[PDB]
Amino acid sequence: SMSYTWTGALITPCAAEESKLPINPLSNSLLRHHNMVYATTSRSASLRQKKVTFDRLQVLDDHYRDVLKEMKAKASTVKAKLLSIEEACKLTPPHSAKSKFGYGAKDVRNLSSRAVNHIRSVWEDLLEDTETPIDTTIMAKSEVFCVQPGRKPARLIVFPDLGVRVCEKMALYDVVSTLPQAVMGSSYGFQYSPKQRVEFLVNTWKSKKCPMGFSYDTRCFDSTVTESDIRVEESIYQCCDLAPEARQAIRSLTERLYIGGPLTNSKGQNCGYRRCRASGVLTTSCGNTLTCYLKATAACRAAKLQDCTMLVNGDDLVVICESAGTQEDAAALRAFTEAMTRYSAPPGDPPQPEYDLELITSCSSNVSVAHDASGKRVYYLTRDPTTPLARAAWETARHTPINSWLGNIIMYAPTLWARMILMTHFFSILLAQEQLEKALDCQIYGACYSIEPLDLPQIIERLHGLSAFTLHSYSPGEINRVASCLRKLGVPPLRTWRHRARSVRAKLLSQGGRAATCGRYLFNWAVRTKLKLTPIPAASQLDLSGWFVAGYSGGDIYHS
Ligand SMILES: COc1ccc(C(=O)Nc2ccc(Oc3ccc(N(C(=O)[C@H]4CC[C@H](C)CC4)C(C)C)c(C(=O)O)c3)cc2)cc1
Ligand SMILES: [Mg+2]
Ligand SMILES: [Mg+2]
Question: Which listed ligand is nearest to 486 at the C-alpha?
Fold first, then answer.
């Protein structure tokens, strides 16, 4: 069927939308070419609409069915619990879109009578009505990027009302948080921290006699997901031991919300109908991960790739296997692509076999190597800094609910660019405004967290190790990419950042306390006379296990 059907009504904005990087004095110290930075708006909605609207083609085969049964067999060991309205409420982000039934996120979190009673009525409705399509809202997403040799059309987000979202958590939060790992095991990407992902990728790469790997980009994955995929996805959920009400909610949610439904713009107009994956539901990440894994695992058998190992994060996929030669590898890959195409997962960028791990990009990142103080090689996760820097520039020119720069500092703490630039720039600004102690929100694997800047040293030590504060001698390729990026965006050269860093470092030390800890560890690279970096006490008590359990992008999840 058609992923979408449109009535003609437009995808409209909720309020005024900014596209150009604002007028301010602090962003310019980060990057001078501000005209290269832009945010997507609803004005480009029609372009995305054209791209995501098409008739899907899907032909299943024995390999697909064999893998599905294998997945259900593992799903069968799971026992999911029903969340209480109170538990489900606490997971709701403070800034979650308000309900159109007289209440918002705050009321939900406060368990206000008006919110709880309506949520309860939505739940009962899910137990009684098994057919009526649930209404959703479709909006153009606002995201920041840097122009390319031009601009990207805004993506479309589709989500149900706040009440329905709370009900989703009640019935499926435990499922989407535990099942993926039980079904895919080591292949489930979100169970890893950046350091662990690298370890998994490096070990997997070293386990092959002659390794060959590739990233597979599915063209607009969400719209390639068919009604059949969503029901197959549910059949896996149904293998879990579930409470009767959870089982009915999952069944109802599947037919009423997940497989499709009517779209309404921000002005309450009927925009059309969806018959593919909605981006803003609790099962999007889990569902995409399961579906991608299922199709890829089956495609590999069809293509006859030797000893395949998948790493899947939602619609993102990387496959590492045994090489059978250059010609055979390229032929097998093309066979793989055809299999995926039949499963309704056609490629955007055609895949290409890689024989160098560092050249494989997955989750917009790649594994690279550097050296610690003692000169020992260390593997870490990095990525092209273009988007991170553009967004950091934007978040500097104006307030944003989520601080991507903080998230990028945590996930990419070992990188040459995060240390030289993001840390220096943001700590410098925080000092000036005297907000080093204020907690800021950021996202990790879609879930929202509240982080205190001054706790960064501990966090980084725990997630990356002490080597994150001593890495040097980065690879030629990594250095080239960072340098090119800085030249392109008009970002000051290393010398300027070292100077700014020395100054930030000094101010931080004179303040003592945690600030002084930030000064010693985060900026040890800026000074000539190094300081001996020993394990930080608070880094031995950090409860960071819950940070890397599952994916929640689009899930409206908040962890306090
Ligand atoms: C105007 O156009 C331009 C814009 C930008 C640039 C530019 O910055 N180019 C530009 C920026 C970075 C470059 O790579 C470097 C520089 C110093 C390093 N070193 C370090 O100790 C670093 C350790 C990590 C820490 C975070 C920084 C120091 C020493 C070897 C000297 C390392 C490394 O460790 O591999 C790598 C090269 C060119 C050049 C021109
Ligand atoms: Mg894609
Ligand atoms: Mg973990």
Answer: 1
Ligand 2 centre to CA of 541 (Å) is 38
Amino acid at 319: V
Choose among 555, 9, 516, 463: nearest CA to 271.
Answer: 9
Contacting residues for 32 by C-beta, under 8 A, at least 6 apart: 489, 490, 491
Q: Which residue has the tokens 């894994």?
A: 293
Long-range own/partner contacts, residues 442-445 (CB < 8 A, 24 or more apart): 442/402, 442/403, 442/404, 442/406, 442/407, 442/410, 443/402, 443/404, 443/407, 444/407, 444/410, 444/411, 444/547, 444/548, 445/190, 445/547, 445/548, 445/550, 445/551, 445/552, 445/553
Closest CA to 542 of 436, 410, 437, 350: 410
User: Annotated binding site: which residue ranges?
Assistant: 217, 315-316
Q: Which pair of tokens denotes residue 331?
A: 């032929």
Strand 447-451 to 440-444 pairing: antiparallel
Q: What separation in Å is there between the alpha carbon of 546 and the centre of ligand 3?
A: 7
DSSP classification of residue 396: H
Domains of the chain, residue spans:
1-362, 363-560
Tell me the resolution in Å: 2.4
Q: How far is CA 67 from CA 135, 300, 519, in A?
A: 34, 11, 52
Residue 96 corresponds to which amino acid? S
Terminal Cα-to-Cα distance of the chain (whole angstroms): 41
Contacts of 454 (CB under 8 A, 6+ apart): 436, 437, 513, 514, 515, 517, 518
Element holding 447 (H helix, E strand):
strand 447-451
CA distance 254 to 235: 10
Considering only CA atoms, which residue is closest to atom 7 of ligand 1? 493
Q: What is the DSSP letter of 188?
A: B
> Which residues does ligand 1 sit against, CB inside 6 Å?
416, 419-420, 472-474, 479, 482-483, 486-487, 491, 493-494, 525
3-class DSSP assignment, residue 30: coil
Collapse the DSSP code of 334 into the 3-class scheme (helix H, G, I; strand E, B; otherwise coil) and give the result. helix
Q: Name the token pair of 541.
A: 């008590």
388 neighbors 408 (Cβ within 8 angstroms)? yes
Give 99 Cα–ligand 3 centroid separation in angstroms. 34
For this PDB entry, the determination method is X-ray
Residues with Cβ < 8 Å from 503, sequence gap 6 or more? 428
Give, for ligand 1, the residue of 29, 369, 416 to mutate: max count of ligand atoms closer than 8 Å to Cβ: 416
Locus of tokens 């372009």: 47
